[PDB]
Structures are given as C-alpha cells and as structure tokens.
mmCIF file of C-alpha atoms in Angstrom:
data_model
loop_
_atom_site.group_PDB
_atom_site.id
_atom_site.type_symbol
_atom_site.label_atom_id
_atom_site.label_comp_id
_atom_site.label_asym_id
_atom_site.label_seq_id
_atom_site.Cartn_x
_atom_site.Cartn_y
_atom_site.Cartn_z
ATOM 1 C CA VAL A 38 -2.765 21.071 6.887
ATOM 2 C CA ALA A 39 -1.801 23.043 3.769
ATOM 3 C CA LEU A 40 -3.561 22.885 0.387
ATOM 4 C CA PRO A 41 -2.746 24.384 -3.050
ATOM 5 C CA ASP A 42 -4.608 27.419 -4.407
ATOM 6 C CA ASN A 43 -5.825 25.188 -7.182
ATOM 7 C CA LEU A 44 -7.217 22.370 -4.984
ATOM 8 C CA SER A 45 -10.575 22.610 -6.747
ATOM 9 C CA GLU A 46 -9.071 22.027 -10.211
ATOM 10 C CA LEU A 47 -7.632 18.785 -8.853
ATOM 11 C CA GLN A 48 -10.865 17.790 -7.104
ATOM 12 C CA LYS A 49 -12.785 18.468 -10.329
ATOM 13 C CA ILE A 50 -10.386 16.446 -12.527
ATOM 14 C CA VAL A 51 -10.517 13.480 -10.101
ATOM 15 C CA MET A 52 -14.315 13.584 -9.811
ATOM 16 C CA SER A 53 -14.910 13.797 -13.565
ATOM 17 C CA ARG A 54 -12.534 10.982 -14.419
ATOM 18 C CA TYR A 55 -14.297 9.021 -11.713
ATOM 19 C CA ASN A 56 -17.618 9.423 -13.527
ATOM 20 C CA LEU A 57 -16.158 8.224 -16.849
ATOM 21 C CA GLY A 58 -16.527 4.624 -15.660
ATOM 22 C CA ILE A 59 -15.306 1.995 -18.119
ATOM 23 C CA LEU A 60 -14.910 3.159 -21.734
ATOM 24 C CA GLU A 61 -14.526 1.070 -24.907
ATOM 25 C CA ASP A 62 -10.856 0.262 -25.536
ATOM 26 C CA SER A 63 -10.408 1.183 -21.858
ATOM 27 C CA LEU A 64 -9.571 -2.310 -20.668
ATOM 28 C CA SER A 65 -7.073 -2.472 -23.552
ATOM 29 C CA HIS A 66 -3.592 -3.680 -22.575
ATOM 30 C CA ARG A 67 -0.603 -1.407 -22.009
ATOM 31 C CA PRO A 68 2.826 -3.136 -21.932
ATOM 32 C CA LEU A 69 4.738 -2.191 -18.795
ATOM 33 C CA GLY A 70 8.045 -2.060 -20.688
ATOM 34 C CA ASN A 71 11.092 -0.811 -18.779
ATOM 35 C CA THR A 72 9.855 -0.404 -15.258
ATOM 36 C CA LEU A 73 11.497 1.752 -12.627
ATOM 37 C CA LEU A 74 10.539 0.539 -9.170
ATOM 38 C CA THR A 75 11.194 2.258 -5.873
ATOM 39 C CA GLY A 76 10.922 0.627 -2.446
ATOM 40 C CA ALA A 77 12.158 -2.759 -3.651
ATOM 41 C CA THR A 78 13.990 -3.419 -0.399
ATOM 42 C CA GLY A 79 10.657 -3.334 1.420
ATOM 43 C CA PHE A 80 7.704 -5.655 2.044
ATOM 44 C CA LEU A 81 5.238 -4.597 -0.656
ATOM 45 C CA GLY A 82 8.269 -4.133 -2.937
ATOM 46 C CA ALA A 83 9.272 -7.814 -2.863
ATOM 47 C CA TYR A 84 5.783 -8.897 -3.882
ATOM 48 C CA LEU A 85 5.673 -6.200 -6.532
ATOM 49 C CA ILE A 86 8.899 -7.609 -7.953
ATOM 50 C CA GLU A 87 7.362 -11.071 -8.041
ATOM 51 C CA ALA A 88 4.044 -9.760 -9.427
ATOM 52 C CA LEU A 89 5.944 -8.035 -12.283
ATOM 53 C CA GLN A 90 7.740 -11.223 -13.381
ATOM 54 C CA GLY A 91 7.081 -11.782 -17.041
ATOM 55 C CA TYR A 92 5.181 -8.581 -17.471
ATOM 56 C CA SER A 93 7.959 -6.028 -17.064
ATOM 57 C CA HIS A 94 10.534 -5.992 -19.813
ATOM 58 C CA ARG A 95 13.100 -5.253 -17.114
ATOM 59 C CA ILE A 96 12.766 -4.023 -13.568
ATOM 60 C CA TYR A 97 15.071 -1.162 -12.738
ATOM 61 C CA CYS A 98 15.313 -1.050 -8.937
ATOM 62 C CA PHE A 99 16.220 2.318 -7.492
ATOM 63 C CA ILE A 100 17.864 1.629 -4.162
ATOM 64 C CA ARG A 101 19.621 4.131 -1.891
ATOM 65 C CA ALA A 102 22.889 2.636 -0.679
ATOM 66 C CA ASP A 103 26.546 3.592 -0.233
ATOM 67 C CA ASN A 104 27.411 1.470 -3.274
ATOM 68 C CA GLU A 105 26.176 -1.082 -5.793
ATOM 69 C CA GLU A 106 27.373 -4.116 -3.796
ATOM 70 C CA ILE A 107 25.478 -3.247 -0.655
ATOM 71 C CA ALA A 108 22.479 -2.270 -2.810
ATOM 72 C CA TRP A 109 22.417 -5.733 -4.360
ATOM 73 C CA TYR A 110 22.830 -7.133 -0.855
ATOM 74 C CA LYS A 111 19.804 -5.238 0.412
ATOM 75 C CA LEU A 112 17.617 -6.297 -2.529
ATOM 76 C CA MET A 113 18.735 -9.942 -2.541
ATOM 77 C CA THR A 114 18.419 -10.307 1.227
ATOM 78 C CA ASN A 115 14.884 -8.919 1.017
ATOM 79 C CA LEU A 116 13.893 -11.174 -1.856
ATOM 80 C CA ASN A 117 15.414 -14.188 -0.127
ATOM 81 C CA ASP A 118 13.314 -13.711 3.002
ATOM 82 C CA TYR A 119 10.070 -14.129 1.085
ATOM 83 C CA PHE A 120 10.816 -16.310 -1.953
ATOM 84 C CA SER A 121 12.803 -19.448 -2.735
ATOM 85 C CA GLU A 122 16.417 -19.379 -3.952
ATOM 86 C CA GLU A 123 15.348 -20.895 -7.290
ATOM 87 C CA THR A 124 12.664 -18.194 -7.706
ATOM 88 C CA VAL A 125 14.874 -15.293 -6.691
ATOM 89 C CA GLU A 126 17.774 -16.396 -8.893
ATOM 90 C CA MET A 127 15.229 -16.464 -11.699
ATOM 91 C CA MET A 128 14.075 -12.907 -10.903
ATOM 92 C CA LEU A 129 17.684 -11.634 -11.083
ATOM 93 C CA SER A 130 17.809 -12.200 -14.813
ATOM 94 C CA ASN A 131 15.308 -9.320 -15.120
ATOM 95 C CA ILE A 132 16.710 -6.989 -12.460
ATOM 96 C CA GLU A 133 18.907 -3.936 -12.741
ATOM 97 C CA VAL A 134 19.717 -2.134 -9.542
ATOM 98 C CA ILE A 135 20.281 1.627 -9.752
ATOM 99 C CA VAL A 136 22.256 3.115 -6.877
ATOM 100 C CA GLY A 137 21.121 6.367 -5.351
ATOM 101 C CA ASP A 138 22.237 8.621 -2.545
ATOM 102 C CA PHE A 139 20.254 11.020 -0.364
ATOM 103 C CA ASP A 143 18.021 12.324 -6.952
ATOM 104 C CA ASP A 144 19.606 14.320 -9.825
ATOM 105 C CA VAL A 145 20.506 10.927 -11.352
ATOM 106 C CA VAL A 146 20.525 9.242 -14.772
ATOM 107 C CA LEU A 147 19.031 5.918 -15.929
ATOM 108 C CA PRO A 148 20.448 3.367 -18.461
ATOM 109 C CA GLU A 149 17.341 3.419 -20.698
ATOM 110 C CA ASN A 150 14.091 5.239 -21.285
ATOM 111 C CA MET A 151 11.527 4.121 -18.712
ATOM 112 C CA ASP A 152 8.035 3.170 -19.852
ATOM 113 C CA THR A 153 6.608 2.835 -16.352
ATOM 114 C CA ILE A 154 7.483 4.021 -12.868
ATOM 115 C CA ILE A 155 6.026 2.492 -9.745
ATOM 116 C CA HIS A 156 6.594 4.530 -6.639
ATOM 117 C CA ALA A 157 6.183 2.340 -3.534
ATOM 118 C CA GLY A 158 8.085 2.695 -0.274
ATOM 119 C CA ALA A 159 9.412 5.919 1.273
ATOM 120 C CA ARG A 160 12.778 7.055 2.661
ATOM 121 C CA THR A 161 13.204 6.293 6.391
ATOM 122 C CA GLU A 169 10.296 16.424 9.173
ATOM 123 C CA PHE A 170 10.220 13.112 7.256
ATOM 124 C CA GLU A 171 7.508 14.861 5.208
ATOM 125 C CA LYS A 172 9.775 17.191 3.191
ATOM 126 C CA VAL A 173 12.231 14.448 2.139
ATOM 127 C CA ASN A 174 9.470 12.031 1.193
ATOM 128 C CA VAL A 175 7.417 14.561 -0.733
ATOM 129 C CA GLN A 176 10.688 15.552 -2.415
ATOM 130 C CA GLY A 177 11.071 11.896 -3.355
ATOM 131 C CA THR A 178 7.630 11.905 -4.960
ATOM 132 C CA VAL A 179 8.620 15.072 -6.857
ATOM 133 C CA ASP A 180 11.949 13.615 -8.036
ATOM 134 C CA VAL A 181 9.922 10.650 -9.346
ATOM 135 C CA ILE A 182 7.419 12.964 -11.058
ATOM 136 C CA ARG A 183 10.227 14.875 -12.830
ATOM 137 C CA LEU A 184 11.597 11.521 -13.924
ATOM 138 C CA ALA A 185 8.287 10.259 -15.305
ATOM 139 C CA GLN A 186 7.813 13.552 -17.106
ATOM 140 C CA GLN A 187 11.243 13.370 -18.731
ATOM 141 C CA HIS A 188 10.711 9.719 -19.756
ATOM 142 C CA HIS A 189 7.053 10.146 -20.735
ATOM 143 C CA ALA A 190 6.218 7.226 -18.451
ATOM 144 C CA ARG A 191 3.026 6.071 -16.854
ATOM 145 C CA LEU A 192 3.539 6.805 -13.168
ATOM 146 C CA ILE A 193 1.863 4.595 -10.599
ATOM 147 C CA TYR A 194 2.045 6.178 -7.162
ATOM 148 C CA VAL A 195 1.413 3.898 -4.193
ATOM 149 C CA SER A 196 -0.477 5.615 -1.380
ATOM 150 C CA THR A 197 -2.469 4.601 1.680
ATOM 151 C CA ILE A 198 -6.203 4.617 2.374
ATOM 152 C CA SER A 199 -5.241 6.243 5.669
ATOM 153 C CA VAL A 200 -5.045 9.618 3.930
ATOM 154 C CA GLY A 201 -8.822 9.585 4.379
ATOM 155 C CA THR A 202 -9.717 7.282 7.247
ATOM 156 C CA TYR A 203 -9.998 9.631 10.256
ATOM 157 C CA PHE A 204 -12.494 12.516 10.549
ATOM 158 C CA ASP A 205 -13.471 14.657 13.504
ATOM 159 C CA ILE A 206 -16.372 13.346 15.598
ATOM 160 C CA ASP A 207 -18.280 16.550 14.798
ATOM 161 C CA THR A 208 -18.207 15.959 11.028
ATOM 162 C CA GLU A 209 -21.202 14.248 9.414
ATOM 163 C CA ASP A 210 -20.116 13.428 5.855
ATOM 164 C CA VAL A 211 -17.478 10.765 6.503
ATOM 165 C CA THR A 212 -17.476 8.559 3.390
ATOM 166 C CA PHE A 213 -14.270 8.241 1.427
ATOM 167 C CA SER A 214 -14.217 6.979 -2.123
ATOM 168 C CA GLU A 215 -11.946 7.010 -5.156
ATOM 169 C CA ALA A 216 -13.563 10.361 -6.055
ATOM 170 C CA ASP A 217 -12.251 12.051 -2.902
ATOM 171 C CA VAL A 218 -9.021 13.931 -2.192
ATOM 172 C CA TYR A 219 -9.726 16.278 0.720
ATOM 173 C CA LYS A 220 -13.006 16.209 2.656
ATOM 174 C CA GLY A 221 -11.952 17.772 5.940
ATOM 175 C CA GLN A 222 -10.204 14.556 7.106
ATOM 176 C CA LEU A 223 -7.698 14.512 9.972
ATOM 177 C CA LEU A 224 -4.116 13.931 8.860
ATOM 178 C CA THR A 225 -2.410 13.515 12.211
ATOM 179 C CA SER A 226 0.386 11.076 11.371
ATOM 180 C CA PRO A 227 3.446 12.462 9.526
ATOM 181 C CA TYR A 228 3.431 9.312 7.355
ATOM 182 C CA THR A 229 -0.105 9.921 6.134
ATOM 183 C CA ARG A 230 0.491 13.650 5.714
ATOM 184 C CA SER A 231 3.472 12.802 3.526
ATOM 185 C CA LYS A 232 1.337 10.365 1.500
ATOM 186 C CA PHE A 233 -1.307 13.070 1.101
ATOM 187 C CA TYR A 234 1.038 15.816 -0.038
ATOM 188 C CA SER A 235 2.492 13.250 -2.434
ATOM 189 C CA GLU A 236 -1.025 12.630 -3.813
ATOM 190 C CA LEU A 237 -1.384 16.384 -4.370
ATOM 191 C CA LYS A 238 1.928 16.559 -6.228
ATOM 192 C CA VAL A 239 0.990 13.647 -8.511
ATOM 193 C CA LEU A 240 -2.473 15.140 -9.147
ATOM 194 C CA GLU A 241 -0.972 18.501 -10.090
ATOM 195 C CA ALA A 242 1.367 16.604 -12.422
ATOM 196 C CA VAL A 243 -1.579 14.780 -13.994
ATOM 197 C CA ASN A 244 -3.521 18.019 -14.366
ATOM 198 C CA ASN A 245 -0.515 19.129 -16.438
ATOM 199 C CA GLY A 246 -0.774 16.001 -18.573
ATOM 200 C CA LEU A 247 1.181 13.195 -16.911
ATOM 201 C CA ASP A 248 -0.249 9.712 -17.214
ATOM 202 C CA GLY A 249 -0.468 9.202 -13.450
ATOM 203 C CA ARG A 250 -2.477 6.869 -11.240
ATOM 204 C CA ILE A 251 -2.725 6.763 -7.489
ATOM 205 C CA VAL A 252 -3.396 3.448 -5.802
ATOM 206 C CA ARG A 253 -4.451 3.593 -2.166
ATOM 207 C CA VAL A 254 -3.699 0.443 -0.224
ATOM 208 C CA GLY A 255 -4.918 -1.160 2.960
ATOM 209 C CA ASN A 256 -3.424 -2.747 6.042
ATOM 210 C CA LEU A 257 -0.735 -4.924 4.426
ATOM 211 C CA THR A 258 -0.391 -8.399 5.938
ATOM 212 C CA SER A 259 1.157 -11.756 5.167
ATOM 213 C CA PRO A 260 0.364 -13.114 1.704
ATOM 214 C CA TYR A 261 -2.881 -15.037 1.291
ATOM 215 C CA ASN A 262 -0.566 -17.692 -0.053
ATOM 216 C CA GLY A 263 3.147 -17.640 0.793
ATOM 217 C CA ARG A 264 5.427 -17.251 3.801
ATOM 218 C CA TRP A 265 4.165 -15.696 7.056
ATOM 219 C CA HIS A 266 7.380 -13.719 7.504
ATOM 220 C CA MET A 267 7.364 -9.963 7.308
ATOM 221 C CA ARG A 268 10.676 -8.170 7.813
ATOM 222 C CA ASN A 269 10.524 -5.639 10.655
ATOM 223 C CA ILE A 270 7.116 -6.925 11.798
ATOM 224 C CA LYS A 271 8.197 -5.932 15.319
ATOM 225 C CA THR A 272 7.773 -2.267 14.402
ATOM 226 C CA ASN A 273 4.493 -2.732 12.533
ATOM 227 C CA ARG A 274 1.752 -1.009 14.644
ATOM 228 C CA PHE A 275 -1.001 -3.458 13.572
ATOM 229 C CA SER A 276 1.176 -6.455 14.507
ATOM 230 C CA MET A 277 2.194 -4.829 17.812
ATOM 231 C CA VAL A 278 -1.379 -4.093 18.779
ATOM 232 C CA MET A 279 -2.471 -7.598 17.721
ATOM 233 C CA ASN A 280 0.238 -9.136 19.905
ATOM 234 C CA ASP A 281 -0.919 -7.083 22.877
ATOM 235 C CA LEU A 282 -4.568 -8.037 22.328
ATOM 236 C CA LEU A 283 -3.612 -11.702 21.821
ATOM 237 C CA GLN A 284 -1.840 -11.892 25.218
ATOM 238 C CA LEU A 285 -4.892 -10.359 26.892
ATOM 239 C CA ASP A 286 -7.819 -12.395 28.174
ATOM 240 C CA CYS A 287 -10.433 -9.783 27.238
ATOM 241 C CA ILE A 288 -11.112 -6.589 25.251
ATOM 242 C CA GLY A 289 -12.458 -3.098 25.956
ATOM 243 C CA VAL A 290 -15.820 -1.863 24.708
ATOM 244 C CA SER A 291 -14.462 0.714 22.270
ATOM 245 C CA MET A 292 -11.754 -1.674 21.066
ATOM 246 C CA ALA A 293 -13.812 -4.761 20.240
ATOM 247 C CA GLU A 294 -15.879 -2.685 17.796
ATOM 248 C CA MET A 295 -12.762 -1.662 15.776
ATOM 249 C CA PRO A 296 -12.635 -2.919 12.146
ATOM 250 C CA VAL A 297 -9.596 -4.898 10.965
ATOM 251 C CA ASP A 298 -8.736 -5.724 7.351
ATOM 252 C CA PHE A 299 -6.321 -8.408 6.175
ATOM 253 C CA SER A 300 -5.024 -6.907 2.939
ATOM 254 C CA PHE A 301 -2.644 -9.594 1.729
ATOM 255 C CA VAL A 302 0.590 -8.195 0.345
ATOM 256 C CA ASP A 303 0.546 -10.684 -2.506
ATOM 257 C CA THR A 304 -3.050 -9.950 -3.588
ATOM 258 C CA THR A 305 -2.356 -6.223 -3.328
ATOM 259 C CA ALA A 306 0.752 -6.518 -5.537
ATOM 260 C CA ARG A 307 -1.092 -8.694 -8.069
ATOM 261 C CA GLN A 308 -3.944 -6.185 -8.282
ATOM 262 C CA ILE A 309 -1.661 -3.116 -8.620
ATOM 263 C CA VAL A 310 0.264 -4.823 -11.423
ATOM 264 C CA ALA A 311 -2.920 -5.813 -13.270
ATOM 265 C CA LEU A 312 -4.095 -2.226 -12.917
ATOM 266 C CA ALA A 313 -0.899 -0.710 -14.265
ATOM 267 C CA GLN A 314 -1.534 -2.492 -17.608
ATOM 268 C CA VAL A 315 -5.064 -1.302 -18.487
ATOM 269 C CA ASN A 316 -6.241 2.066 -19.790
ATOM 270 C CA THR A 317 -8.993 3.017 -17.382
ATOM 271 C CA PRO A 318 -9.275 6.848 -17.205
ATOM 272 C CA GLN A 319 -9.691 7.034 -13.411
ATOM 273 C CA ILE A 320 -6.879 8.733 -11.526
ATOM 274 C CA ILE A 321 -7.453 7.181 -8.107
ATOM 275 C CA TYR A 322 -8.011 3.525 -7.207
ATOM 276 C CA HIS A 323 -8.678 1.660 -3.938
ATOM 277 C CA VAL A 324 -6.712 -1.605 -3.735
ATOM 278 C CA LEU A 325 -7.621 -3.036 -0.339
ATOM 279 C CA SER A 326 -9.557 -5.971 1.089
ATOM 280 C CA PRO A 327 -13.335 -5.371 0.838
ATOM 281 C CA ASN A 328 -13.799 -7.816 3.707
ATOM 282 C CA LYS A 329 -13.041 -5.986 6.928
ATOM 283 C CA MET A 330 -14.103 -7.662 10.187
ATOM 284 C CA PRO A 331 -14.107 -6.334 13.774
ATOM 285 C CA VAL A 332 -11.303 -7.065 16.288
ATOM 286 C CA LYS A 333 -13.514 -9.078 18.619
ATOM 287 C CA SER A 334 -14.839 -11.235 15.743
ATOM 288 C CA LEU A 335 -11.209 -12.062 14.864
ATOM 289 C CA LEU A 336 -10.009 -12.515 18.458
ATOM 290 C CA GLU A 337 -12.914 -14.936 18.924
ATOM 291 C CA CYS A 338 -12.317 -16.794 15.639
ATOM 292 C CA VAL A 339 -8.762 -17.400 16.923
ATOM 293 C CA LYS A 340 -8.934 -17.929 20.711
ATOM 294 C CA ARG A 341 -11.801 -20.338 19.968
ATOM 295 C CA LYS A 342 -13.230 -18.983 23.234
ATOM 296 C CA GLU A 343 -15.629 -16.076 23.849
ATOM 297 C CA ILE A 344 -13.649 -12.912 24.652
ATOM 298 C CA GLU A 345 -14.884 -11.034 27.750
ATOM 299 C CA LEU A 346 -15.837 -7.338 27.415
ATOM 300 C CA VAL A 347 -14.441 -4.988 30.081
ATOM 301 C CA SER A 348 -15.075 -1.214 30.276
ATOM 302 C CA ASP A 349 -12.842 1.089 28.189
ATOM 303 C CA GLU A 350 -11.766 2.374 31.626
ATOM 304 C CA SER A 351 -10.956 -0.963 33.319
ATOM 305 C CA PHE A 352 -9.338 -2.124 30.069
ATOM 306 C CA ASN A 353 -7.128 1.007 29.869
ATOM 307 C CA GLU A 354 -6.146 0.175 33.454
ATOM 308 C CA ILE A 355 -5.118 -3.376 32.466
ATOM 309 C CA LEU A 356 -3.261 -2.070 29.367
ATOM 310 C CA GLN A 357 -1.384 0.541 31.429
ATOM 311 C CA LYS A 358 -0.409 -2.029 34.081
ATOM 312 C CA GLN A 359 1.254 -4.387 31.597
ATOM 313 C CA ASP A 360 3.169 -1.393 30.157
ATOM 314 C CA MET A 361 1.424 -1.711 26.783
ATOM 315 C CA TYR A 362 2.057 1.791 25.464
ATOM 316 C CA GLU A 363 1.490 0.469 21.944
ATOM 317 C CA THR A 364 -2.160 -0.532 22.355
ATOM 318 C CA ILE A 365 -2.919 2.515 24.533
ATOM 319 C CA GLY A 366 -1.763 4.861 21.734
ATOM 320 C CA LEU A 367 -4.222 3.419 19.230
ATOM 321 C CA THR A 368 -6.956 3.350 21.945
ATOM 322 C CA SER A 369 -6.426 7.120 22.245
ATOM 323 C CA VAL A 370 -6.469 7.474 18.435
ATOM 324 C CA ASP A 371 -9.911 5.763 18.382
ATOM 325 C CA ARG A 372 -11.624 7.531 21.310
ATOM 326 C CA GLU A 373 -10.915 11.079 20.030
ATOM 327 C CA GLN A 374 -11.407 10.586 16.251
ATOM 328 C CA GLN A 375 -14.205 9.227 13.964
ATOM 329 C CA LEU A 376 -13.800 6.273 11.566
ATOM 330 C CA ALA A 377 -14.494 6.915 7.855
ATOM 331 C CA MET A 378 -16.718 4.755 5.664
ATOM 332 C CA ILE A 379 -14.402 3.722 2.817
ATOM 333 C CA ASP A 380 -15.924 3.031 -0.611
ATOM 334 C CA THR A 381 -14.319 0.653 -3.136
ATOM 335 C CA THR A 382 -17.175 0.058 -5.607
ATOM 336 C CA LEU A 383 -15.491 1.407 -8.757
ATOM 337 C CA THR A 384 -12.087 -0.176 -8.224
ATOM 338 C CA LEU A 385 -13.861 -3.472 -7.504
ATOM 339 C CA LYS A 386 -15.844 -3.294 -10.755
ATOM 340 C CA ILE A 387 -12.675 -2.583 -12.762
ATOM 341 C CA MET A 388 -10.920 -5.481 -11.020
ATOM 342 C CA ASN A 389 -13.672 -7.990 -11.864
ATOM 343 C CA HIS A 390 -13.272 -6.818 -15.454
ATOM 344 C CA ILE A 391 -9.644 -7.947 -15.282
ATOM 345 C CA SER A 392 -10.744 -11.265 -13.794
ATOM 346 C CA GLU A 393 -9.027 -10.386 -10.518
ATOM 347 C CA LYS A 394 -10.724 -11.052 -7.181
ATOM 348 C CA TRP A 395 -9.924 -10.871 -3.455
ATOM 349 C CA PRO A 396 -9.406 -14.349 -2.010
ATOM 350 C CA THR A 397 -11.611 -15.787 0.748
ATOM 351 C CA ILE A 398 -10.115 -15.773 4.247
ATOM 352 C CA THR A 399 -10.254 -18.930 6.397
ATOM 353 C CA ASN A 400 -10.265 -19.906 10.065
ATOM 354 C CA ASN A 401 -7.146 -22.013 9.552
ATOM 355 C CA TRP A 402 -5.313 -19.084 8.012
ATOM 356 C CA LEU A 403 -6.273 -16.849 10.925
ATOM 357 C CA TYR A 404 -5.184 -19.465 13.445
ATOM 358 C CA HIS A 405 -1.719 -19.973 11.976
ATOM 359 C CA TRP A 406 -1.505 -16.213 11.538
ATOM 360 C CA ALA A 407 -2.039 -15.606 15.228
ATOM 361 C CA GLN A 408 0.417 -18.387 16.129
ATOM 362 C CA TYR A 409 2.922 -16.697 13.816
ATOM 363 C CA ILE A 410 2.623 -13.342 15.515
ATOM 364 C CA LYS A 411 2.591 -14.800 19.032
ATOM 365 C CA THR A 412 5.805 -16.690 18.080
ATOM 366 C CA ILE A 413 7.691 -13.833 16.320
ATOM 367 C CA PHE A 414 7.126 -11.709 19.439
ATOM 368 C CA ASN A 415 7.820 -14.007 22.451
#
C-alpha cells in the first residue's frame, strides 16, 4: 500500500478529535439543507433517500447516465424496488436528478451537505478520483461532507501481528488491504482526512455488512453478486460446516437502520471525524445456521469440508475460506459511536428467530 508523507498529521488529528468526546452544544442540530447525494441508484442509496425525507430541503441526486431520462429511469426503478408507489411518488417532490458523465460539472444551487455513498462500477483510480471530485465540490460549496466508507478498511491483519483492534481512532495500523474495493475506500478516507486537515467539515462513516432492512422488503437488487449472500446460499445448501468456517462472525447490519443512523449523525455537531455505523451484535456462522436449520449442524474438518465445497463447484465459498485461513480477524470497536447514537435516541434493533428464518427462505428462493 501507499501512504502520504503526512500520515501522522492525519493520525494525530483523528486521535485528538476522538478524545474530545461529547462537548456542550455538540449535540446541537445542523439543518441538512440542499443535499447532494451520490450512489442513489444503489441499495444503501435508496434507504438514504428515504431516511432523508423531511430532513433534507431538497435531495440533489448525482447520477451518471447518457441523459436525464435514463437517469430518472435508473433512480425511479431503484426506488420502486424497495418502496411503495405512493411513497416514491411522494419522494419525487423533493428530488432533483443531476446528470453526469464519466466531474467538471455545475449544480443548480449552493449545496449545504454532500453525502458520498456508492462508487463507480484499476477501479481504484476512478473511484478515488470520484472522492476527490466530491471533495473539490464540498470545498467550493462550503458543505459538510459525509463520506461513506466500509469497516473492511481495517478488518484483516496478518496472523503475525498482535495489536489487532480497530476503533474510530484508527486509520492505518498495519492492516491488510487486499481487495481493490477496500483499497479504494481507504485511499478515499485519506483524501477526505487531508481535506479535513485543511479545514473541510468532513466526517467518515464506516459501515458494516449491509443486509435487508430490519423492517421493509427482503429484496436487494443484484443480491446474486453480493459475496455474503452467495456464501450464505452455499452454506445453506450444505448439510454441515467446516471447523474454521463455523467460527466466523456474521453481522446483520440492516440497510434501513444504517441509513437512519447516518442521517441522524449528519445533523449533529460532534467533533469526531470517524464513526462506526454497524451492528454491534455480530454472531458466528454456525450459531446462525443452527438458528435457521432448526437442526444441529455437523462439523467436518476444514480439509474434508474444502473437499465437499470443491466437488459442488462452489468457488464462491472456497474464496472466502482461503481469505480466512491466511489472514487474521480484527477486533472492531464501536464504543464512541454507540454512545453518540444513544445521545440521539437512536438504537440498533433486536434481531429475531422469525426474521432469520424468513431471511434464509428469501435467499434460498432468490437463488434457486
């Protein structure tokens, strides 16, 4: 990986803001105003657009598309997959779509807030460049920038490393950044931090493994290409699990709860630069698999299990098996972001056996 000469200035600024905790007039409200949103044609984006309803003055949706008509079509088709016609029609009265092409572009008003979710799809240069285009924009408009990142920028260490925690006070600890997606998210974090260090009002919100809403429709567009869903399908067909695979932690970080939390967070004046918005209730794969089969899962060797996975041509679950055997799993810390959230009267909802059952039936059905 590649780090700036000034990495320590950024680490220091993050760490010190982290220690500030909650000030007086720190939970004071900041109107979202005109809100530029990226990634609105995606999964988290839909729920962000709902979560903003009646908080944003308007929602300017930057959408790359050959023209305005197809851009509307992308946004509306997205919104219609998750929400009711009544609801969506209602959202339209607050939506402007802004058409982009693969961003030296102009916007109808001065933006008060930019929320940068979803990436373009080396993918790293174009994506980082997207983050930078957004930073220039937020600098020109003097806008609070919320950048949406992933906890996976700090989830995998080497097995040799000892210090493997990862909190809202961390940026780089030695972590492995194997995936190009995560590397892009990381470099984006470094760009936004450098921007902040120069005076931008910028927050970074790291998010978890995004799943169906706690309360909404099961459907998730392109769930077929969602590595967690793929692996869960594979494991759900199977009649057992491997030793190193049953121990693996799984978090259901509801898209709706995520979106609700991010939007709450974008309206307070907490001095922290980095936040962790993910479910604080992880549970291991076997515990889940058992809570859903309603039958005790049998534990085969990692060897015999990799045999059975390779026989059924399950490249998908074998890839993650190989990502777990040769890397170490970080201990993620969310204590600060949790405290701030309970100060906003926002809490993570409690997950039920019914919900997990119908969840597994959903995935089994959307695959076969």
